[PDB]
Amino acid sequence: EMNPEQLWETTMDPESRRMLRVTVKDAIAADQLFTTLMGDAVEPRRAFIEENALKAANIDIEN
DNA sequence: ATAAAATCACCCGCACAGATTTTTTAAAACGCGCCACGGGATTTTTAAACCGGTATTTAACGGTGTATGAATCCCGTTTTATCTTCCTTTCACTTTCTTTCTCCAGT
Numbered sequence: 001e002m003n004p005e006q007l008w009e010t011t012m013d014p015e016s017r018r019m020l021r022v023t024v025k026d027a028i029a030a031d032q033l034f035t036t037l038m039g040d041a042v043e044p045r046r047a048f049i050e051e052n053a054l055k056a057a058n059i060d061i062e063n
Numbered sequence: 064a065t066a067a068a069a070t071c072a073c074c075c076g077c078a079c080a081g082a083t084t085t086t087t088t089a090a091a092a093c094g095c096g097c098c099a100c101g102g103g104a105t106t107t108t109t110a111a112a113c114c115g116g117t118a119t120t121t122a123a124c125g126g127t128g129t130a131t132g133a134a135t136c137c138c139g140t141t142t143t144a145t146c147t148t149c150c151t152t153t154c155a156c157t158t159t160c161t162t163t164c165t166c167c168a169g170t
Contacts, residue, residue: 042076 011017024030036044 009016036048039045
């Protein structure tokens with residue numbers, strides 16, 4: 001849906017683009033997270049979705 | 064360049080039918096041993112053949128009235144003879160990669 005010049009000047013020009021470089025911090029945690037999210041089991045994924053999304057959003061700090 | 068008509072891959076949960084894969088179990092087998100059973104040589108007893116005779120019990124024979132066996136006509140069942148096929152295989156050809164041989168401009 002974008003014109004080529006817009007795409008160039010917004011994403012592909014090395015002088016005016018911003019990107020992210022992917023790095024790995026801890027190997028143990030990453031494997032567990034990948035297994036939980038992309039694995040065949042359903043219950044751990046549902047529990048993880050419920051904990052982070054349904055909860056942990058009603059922040060009771062107000063500061 | 065305008066019209067007419069078509070086709071396929073993946074993501075997300077859940078329930079179930081079907082296809083491997085271990086795991087357990089009952090049957091078959093092997094080695095060793097002993098005593099239950101059958102062979103051989105005497106005693107004993109009884110099953111059946113044999114004479115009677117008598118008293119029944121069966122089968123062959125002569126009428127009636129059916130039930131069935133061989134023949135005919137079909138249609139689903141299984142065999143056998145008869146076509147096409149995909150993987151194995153090499154193999155001559157082609158292509159593509161690697162090393163070598165010069166040219167050759169520059170100093």
